[PDB]
Amino acid sequence: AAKNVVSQFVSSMSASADVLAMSKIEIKLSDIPEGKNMAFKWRGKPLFVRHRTKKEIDQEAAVEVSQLRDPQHDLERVKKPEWVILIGVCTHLGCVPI
Amino acid sequence: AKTLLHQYWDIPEGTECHRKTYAATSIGGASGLVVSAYSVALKTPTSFLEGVARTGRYTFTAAAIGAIFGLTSCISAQVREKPDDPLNYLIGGCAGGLTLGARTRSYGIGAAACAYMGLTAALVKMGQLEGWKVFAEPKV
Amino acid sequence: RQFGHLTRVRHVITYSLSPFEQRAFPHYFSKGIPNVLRRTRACILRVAPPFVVFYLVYTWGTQEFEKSKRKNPAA
Amino acid sequence: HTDIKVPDFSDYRRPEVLDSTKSSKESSEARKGFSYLITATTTVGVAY
Amino acid sequence: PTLTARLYSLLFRRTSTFALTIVVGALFFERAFDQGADAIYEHINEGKLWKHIKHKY
Amino acid sequence: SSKWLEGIRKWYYNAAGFNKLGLMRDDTIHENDDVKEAIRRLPENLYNDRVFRIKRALDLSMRQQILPKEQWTKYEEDKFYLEPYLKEVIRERKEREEWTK
Amino acid sequence: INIRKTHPLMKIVNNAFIDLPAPSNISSWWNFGSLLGICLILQILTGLFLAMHYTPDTTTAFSSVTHICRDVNYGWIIRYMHANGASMFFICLFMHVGRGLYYGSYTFLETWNIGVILLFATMATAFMGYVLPWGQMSFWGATVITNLLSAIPYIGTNLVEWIWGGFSVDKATLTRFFAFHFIFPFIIAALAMVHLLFLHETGSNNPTGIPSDTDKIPFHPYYTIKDILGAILLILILMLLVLFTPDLLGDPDNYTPANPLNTPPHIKPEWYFLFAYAILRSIPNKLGGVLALVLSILVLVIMPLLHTSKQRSMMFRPISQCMFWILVADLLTLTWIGGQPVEHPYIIIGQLASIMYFLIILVMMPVASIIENNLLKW
Amino acid sequence: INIRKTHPLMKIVNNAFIDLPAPSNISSWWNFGSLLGICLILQILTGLFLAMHYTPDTTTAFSSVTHICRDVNYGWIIRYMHANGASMFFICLFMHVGRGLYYGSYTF
Amino acid sequence: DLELHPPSYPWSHRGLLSSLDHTSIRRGFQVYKQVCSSCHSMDYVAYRHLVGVCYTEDEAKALAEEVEVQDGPNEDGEMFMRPGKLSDYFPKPYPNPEAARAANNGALPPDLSYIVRARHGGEDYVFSLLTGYCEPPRVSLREGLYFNPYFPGQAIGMAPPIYNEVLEFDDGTPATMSQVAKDVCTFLRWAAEPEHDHRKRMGLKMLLMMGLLLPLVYAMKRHKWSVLKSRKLAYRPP
Amino acid sequence: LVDPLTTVREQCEQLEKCVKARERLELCDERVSSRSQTEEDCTEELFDFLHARDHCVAHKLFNSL
Numbered sequence A: 001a002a003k004n005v006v007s008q009f010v011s012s013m014s015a016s017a018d019v020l021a022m023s024k025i026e027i028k029l030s031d032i033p034e035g036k037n038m039a040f041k042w043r044g045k046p047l048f049v050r051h052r053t054k055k056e057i058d059q060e061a062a063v064e065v066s067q068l069r070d071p072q073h074d075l076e077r078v079k080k081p082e083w084v085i086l087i088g089v090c091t092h093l094g095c096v097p098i
Numbered sequence B: 001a002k003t004l005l006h007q008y009w010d011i012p013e014g015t016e017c018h019r020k021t022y023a024a025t026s027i028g029g030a031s032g033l034v035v036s037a038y039s040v041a042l043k044t045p046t047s048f049l050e051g052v053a054r055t056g057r058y059t060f061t062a063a064a065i066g067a068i069f070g071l072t073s074c075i076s077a078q079v080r081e082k083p084d085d086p087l088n089y090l091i092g093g094c095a096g097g098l099t100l101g102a103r104t105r106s107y108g109i110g111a112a113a114c115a116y117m118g119l120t121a122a123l124v125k126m127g128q129l130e131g132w133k134v135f136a137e138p139k140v
Numbered sequence C: 001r002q003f004g005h006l007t008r009v010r011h012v013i014t015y016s017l018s019p020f021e022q023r024a025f026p027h028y029f030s031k032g033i034p035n036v037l038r039r040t041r042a043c044i045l046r047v048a049p050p051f052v053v054f055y056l057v058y059t060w061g062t063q064e065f066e067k068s069k070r071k072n073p074a075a
Numbered sequence D: 001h002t003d004i005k006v007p008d009f010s011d012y013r014r015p016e017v018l019d020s021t022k023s024s025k026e027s028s029e030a031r032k033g034f035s036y037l038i039t040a041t042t043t044v045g046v047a048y
Numbered sequence E: 001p002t003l004t005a006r007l008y009s010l011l012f013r014r015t016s017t018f019a020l021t022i023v024v025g026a027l028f029f030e031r032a033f034d035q036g037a038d039a040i041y042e043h044i045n046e047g048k049l050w051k052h053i054k055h056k057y
Numbered sequence F: 001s002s003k004w005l006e007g008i009r010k011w012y013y014n015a016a017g018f019n020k021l022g023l024m025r026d027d028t029i030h031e032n033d034d035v036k037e038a039i040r041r042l043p044e045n046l047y048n049d050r051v052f053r054i055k056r057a058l059d060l061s062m063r064q065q066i067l068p069k070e071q072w073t074k075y076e077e078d079k080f081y082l083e084p085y086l087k088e089v090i091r092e093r094k095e096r097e098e099w100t101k
Numbered sequence G: 001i002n003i004r005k006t007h008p009l010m011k012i013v014n015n016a017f018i019d020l021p022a023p024s025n026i027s028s029w030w031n032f033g034s035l036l037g038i039c040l041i042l043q044i045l046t047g048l049f050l051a052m053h054y055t056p057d058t059t060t061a062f063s064s065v066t067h068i069c070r071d072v073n074y075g076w077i078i079r080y081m082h083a084n085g086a087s088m089f090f091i092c093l094f095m096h097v098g099r100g101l102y103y104g105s106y107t108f109l110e111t112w113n114i115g116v117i118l119l120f121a122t123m124a125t126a127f128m129g130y131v132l133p134w135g136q137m138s139f140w141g142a143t144v145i146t147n148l149l150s151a152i153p154y155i156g157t158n159l160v161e162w163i164w165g166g167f168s169v170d171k172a173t174l175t176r177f178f179a180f181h182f183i184f185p186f187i188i189a190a191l192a193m194v195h196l197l198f199l200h201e202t203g204s205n206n207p208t209g210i211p212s213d214t215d216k217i218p219f220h221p222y223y224t225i226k227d228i229l230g231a232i233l234l235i236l237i238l239m240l241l242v243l244f245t246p247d248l249l250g251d252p253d254n255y256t257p258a259n260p261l262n263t264p265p266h267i268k269p270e271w272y273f274l275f276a277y278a279i280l281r282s283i284p285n286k287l288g289g290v291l292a293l294v295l296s297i298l299v300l301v302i303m304p305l306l307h308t309s310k311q312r313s314m315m316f317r318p319i320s321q322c323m324f325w326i327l328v329a330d331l332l333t334l335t336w337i338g339g340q341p342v343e344h345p346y347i348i349i350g351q352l353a354s355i356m357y358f359l360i361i362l363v364m365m366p367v368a369s370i371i372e373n374n375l376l377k378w
Numbered sequence H: 001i002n003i004r005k006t007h008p009l010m011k012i013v014n015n016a017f018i019d020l021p022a023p024s025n026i027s028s029w030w031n032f033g034s035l036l037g038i039c040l041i042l043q044i045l046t047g048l049f050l051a052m053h054y055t056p057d058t059t060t061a062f063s064s065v066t067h068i069c070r071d072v073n074y075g076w077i078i079r080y081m082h083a084n085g086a087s088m089f090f091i092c093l094f095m096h097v098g099r100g101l102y103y104g105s106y107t108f
Numbered sequence I: 001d002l003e004l005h006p007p008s009y010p011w012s013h014r015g016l017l018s019s020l021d022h023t024s025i026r027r028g029f030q031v032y033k034q035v036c037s038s039c040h041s042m043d044y045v046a047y048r049h050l051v052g053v054c055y056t057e058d059e060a061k062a063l064a065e066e067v068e069v070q071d072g073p074n075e076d077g078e079m080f081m082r083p084g085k086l087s088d089y090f091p092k093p094y095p096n097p098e099a100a101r102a103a104n105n106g107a108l109p110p111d112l113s114y115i116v117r118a119r120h121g122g123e124d125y126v127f128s129l130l131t132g133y134c135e136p137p138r139v140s141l142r143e144g145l146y147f148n149p150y151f152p153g154q155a156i157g158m159a160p161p162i163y164n165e166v167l168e169f170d171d172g173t174p175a176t177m178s179q180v181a182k183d184v185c186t187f188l189r190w191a192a193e194p195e196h197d198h199r200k201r202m203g204l205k206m207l208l209m210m211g212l213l214l215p216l217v218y219a220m221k222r223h224k225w226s227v228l229k230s231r232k233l234a235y236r237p238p
Numbered sequence J: 001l002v003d004p005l006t007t008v009r010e011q012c013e014q015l016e017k018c019v020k021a022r023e024r025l026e027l028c029d030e031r032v033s034s035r036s037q038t039e040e041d042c043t044e045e046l047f048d049f050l051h052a053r054d055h056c057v058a059h060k061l062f063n064s065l
């Protein structure tokens, strides 16, 4: 009975059921010229939607594979060379990488 | 030697700091070894441990005065932000004379050393600031 | 800890005088000023060489900041 | 044990009590009042 | 010095007399000192406050 | 050689500071219970002199004032009295440990 | 006989704060215990009036703090007094910690353990109260430090989801931190009484480290008037700061509303955390970093288990005092490292200074202890 | 010998809980001291979790308590523990006082 | 890039015991209501805060009556607006920050309650920002973005009224550049600190009470401690 | 209608290391303009002497206000 009450208190401190109401998002892409990263809030996190530049596509194509701590090739993650969508969150601690 | 005094004065003064104090300690080590070399030539210590002790005292004290001179040079130059006076090195020479009197452990020598080392240091920087040549023209 | 069973002392006479018949500041600018200068003599040789070394590293750190953020290339 | 003498507090005594021959009855009220008046002005400031 | 001695004899002998003494002293010096403090604060500006140019309009 | 180490010792004894409050070497010892046994086992006269020197030291540090030049306990004439007694107390400590193990 | 030793409340108070046999030669640095107590109860009072004028919600928080600083009269000095009182609290607290480290008073073991518990409690209180204004610096410091708590694997992620009250920094996080910034200083006050309890049992400590049980005076009326002098010095510095420079410790990033989008590069925490926040981004390892931080304050736990020198003072040792003042300069260097942005040279000297921190403590103070233990025939 | 008798906290614990010489005669009408204590810290606990999930403003007060009724997991039982624990608390406080007035402990 | 360091000026209120020029605050609010109350919003001041600072009560009430409110519900419940006299904030020329962002080249204008204290530098930064407009050595110049060195990134979507829209002051003071800019920055210093004159009053009262209280406490401690400074010890054995 | 701001701005920088840094700026500006489309843009100098001139102007600005 004590651990039932302990679980009652832990689950009371766990999360809020209306905050459990997350959603999906629907983003329009024609107001976004080249090199522009628009940050739409969703899930309490930044949603970066960026139309990059082609000069930075040269600067990313000149990024080497096997000299990094984790090679994740840009073609192996996204669909287009100049469009990219991220959770705008540095996985260290969750800042806004500007 | 000309190389290390040239290294001391080539620093813009100015602040490029702690190179100034390293050069000043090298000046002090050289001058202490010079005067101690004459002294160990002209005293005959016996024992030789005393000879090393006297040379160590002379080198250590001249290096100490060089360090303290360079330290208050650097600090006064950074604080006053007016690198052209001799007043900051007047503070320099007085501080060096005070710690000379500290490491010989009497205070009147420290007082007169403050006065004369301050006057000489103000004149040294001031003469560099106008430009009075080393030892000669020697033209006409 | 109570007050009275601390130790055993013989052979000691403690004189002391009332607060009223003595004065407030006996030779305050006459002995207290060499007193504080002697206290400062006992410490600064082994207090300052941390702080000035910190200070020169601080100046050098701001120096590296400015000269390495402002680069002046050849172009 | 009769050779217990006090070291003299002539460096520390007040100017009314530096005289080791005049009586200290008519010197009492002024001295005690001056100390208590300093305490009173302190208490006035703290109460303010 | 007897003026401090007679001050001791009048106002410092008794306890509640001492308390009533510091009551009257703190109140009067409170009043006069706040007046003097505001006077010094207006003297150190004399042309910057709102009060004088609000009544000269 | 051996003369130089002793000179370092003399310098350090002067720069330590506990000769400026008139103390001696065996009066600054930090108390475990072995120190408390060694303080318990002292002869009476040196115990009285110990408490007098300690009480003058606490007085002078209360008014934060150093003794004159002349009353400083000069080097290697101080009595090194505690090291026999404390030595034997630590010896009996080692004896208990080596007997019960 | 006397009510002061018959009435049972006054039995404890008369054996605590009146007839307490302190030694006779206390210097300036032992006032700081009373100063920490007075800072604490002034914190409790100013926070109480703050709690009477505050509405805690992410929609309403900055509006309400602005409302306090404008309309409710004298609340501007109540707010500024609470902030700078926390500042003076931590200055007095590091002085009291430094005293206890310096004069060899760390031999008092369970007192010292109770001390470290008090130190963590004050750090948690200051952190949560600094979340409370709900500005930009508040918001991003909150998110940074909570994911730093998430650095521990397999439970710490869910632990951080648990202490959020949400999936991000939400309203629920704000009211959780309001409740704990309220309730922790009472725990601090009770543990302060426990600290004082063990101290009264074991005995106090003179400056010279000599066992000073031959020259006691009672606590009244000597140290009472000494600590009232100290409290007036506190009020002096505190009113000087809250009436002449409220911006000497104020942050320009706090006074904007919490934009969850902008995140300026001015990202430093509250300033007296910067002795330890700099270590946390010194080592380029996440779990290793947060373990290194907790291990720094655990080094402050396991301080007394390294004293082996035979005299407990450091007025009577040069070399240990030298390394201790290098330790003071090292802490100030680390705070300055925390108060500067991320580059190459700052990272060089920050790594050097954190290694010098642990190198002073775990090596140099025991090596000096051995060398004076060997130097004077001990 | 024992940590219970010499440790400076545990002397207070020894004189509090272990070795209080009580009379060997009291029936259940003397329970209410510790009962009021457990009621009191249970009240503190329920109210603490309440104030974790509560916003004090007349715009948002009843909506916040409604939120405790709806979205906090077991929030309705935490709110009801606080309310009826207060009611139990005042019942037991009158029981404590009725004892102390009946059985003559009011000579203290 | 760089951060251009702002200067430090010999202000009227720079010294630690100065007031603020209330006449300068009056004309600063005048400049605010002319030009600066179009882009920037300053919600956290009401009209009643001006009632004893730089405007009289009646003049400021008419000034608040100059601007409509769009108050909330009435008897029917839908709409009406209000004259607005005294319980009244300064009404929000941009309702949505998205609408504010849309009305310019992005870049929503900051709110002007806590600017002087919240921008890494006081009113010096606002002044030198306001006056420092100049021309670039070939930056990208994205179509609407004025170069200005007193800003990180230097690209500013704010037109300078630094002489533009001279507004015909209510007295006849010359409508030059430094005059209008310094007086509206003085107004913004006031709007950040509604306690400044009062706080330096209490600071001076504290100065006098600590210059008049502290040496007496120090003397009393030295008096009661004077026993222990004068006690002298002596050794009696057999 | 003439502000004293432009007056003291004109007035402070008669002969100065501000003017020396203007000559430094025009030297790197001729390097920029006489080399077609490289990276270096001669902007560091522009910042640092406009700081210098605004400080020397700020030294005596509040006279005729």
Ligand code: HEC
Pocket (backbone or CB within 6 Å): I035, I036, I037, I038, I039, I040, I104, I107, I108, I109, I110, I115, I119, I126, I129, I155, I156, I157, I158, I159, I161, I184
């Ligand atoms: C619309 C045009 C105006 C007008 C009439 C004024 N400002 Fe300015 N302002 C505007 C924008 C769109 C922005 C944001 C873009 C940017 O910051 O580059 C700003 C910015 C400011 C700031 C912020 C500076 C900072 O971030 O440190 C300030 C302090 C500011 N504006 C002040 C200000 C004042 C006092 C005005 C009246 C004279 C004023 N602005 C007019 C847009 C506009």
Ligand code: HEM
Pocket (backbone or CB within 6 Å): G040, G043, G044, G045, G046, G047, G048, G050, G051, G054, G065, G079, G082, G083, G085, G086, G087, G089, G125, G126, G129, G130, G132, G133, G181, G182, G183, G184, G185, G186
């Ligand atoms: C239990 C007593 C306390 C209460 C009720 C309390 C209440 C508050 C409140 C309401 C705030 C927000 C006000 C504001 O930030 O402008 C606050 C802020 C703060 N409190 Fe406390 N507090 C208490 C004790 C403490 C203590 C003991 C400390 C630590 C010394 C502390 C440190 C802080 C800090 C650092 C802030 C942030 C100040 C700021 O950003 O303005 N508080 N407190």
Ligand code: HEM
Pocket (backbone or CB within 6 Å): G030, G031, G033, G034, G036, G037, G093, G096, G097, G100, G103, G105, G106, G108, G111, G112, G113, G114, G115, G116, G118, G119, G188, G192, G195, G196, G199, G203, G204, G205, G206
């Ligand atoms: C919550 C904050 C703290 C408060 C309010 C506090 C309060 C006090 C007080 C009132 C004293 C007695 C002062 C005296 O006798 O002169 C004291 C003594 C002491 N405290 Fe703390 N303390 C705190 C935190 C700490 C911490 C973190 C430590 C370190 C672990 C510590 C270690 C000590 C020590 C060693 C003493 C003995 C002083 C001596 O006799 O030398 N305290 N404390």
Ligand code: HEM
Pocket (backbone or CB within 6 Å): H030, H031, H032, H033, H034, H036, H037, H093, H096, H097, H100, H105, H106, H108
């Ligand atoms: C705040 C609520 C109270 C608590 C928590 C409380 C707690 C206690 C406790 C723990 C005891 C000792 C054990 C016991 O006798 O039950 C006690 C005894 C007592 N209480 Fe209270 N009490 C409270 C309120 C009161 C009140 C209002 C009175 C009436 C003035 C009162 C009068 C007494 C008396 C006379 C005793 C002695 C009874 C005895 O031990 O024989 N208590 N109380």
Ligand code: HEM
Pocket (backbone or CB within 6 Å): H040, H043, H044, H045, H046, H047, H048, H050, H051, H054, H065, H079, H082, H083, H085, H086, H087, H089
């Ligand atoms: C310090 C600890 C306490 C906290 C933090 C606390 C907190 C709260 C809060 C937030 C509420 C409003 C929520 C609600 O009731 O809907 C509340 C209500 C209430 N509390 Fe407490 N409380 C505390 C202690 C107590 C105690 C000791 C009692 C008395 C036994 C008590 C009796 C009540 C009552 C009767 C209500 C009204 C309940 C209702 O009608 O809804 N509280 N408390």
Ligand code: FES
Pocket (backbone or CB within 6 Å): A090, A091, A092, A093, A094, A095
């Ligand atoms: S680097 Fe630490 S959070 Fe992005």
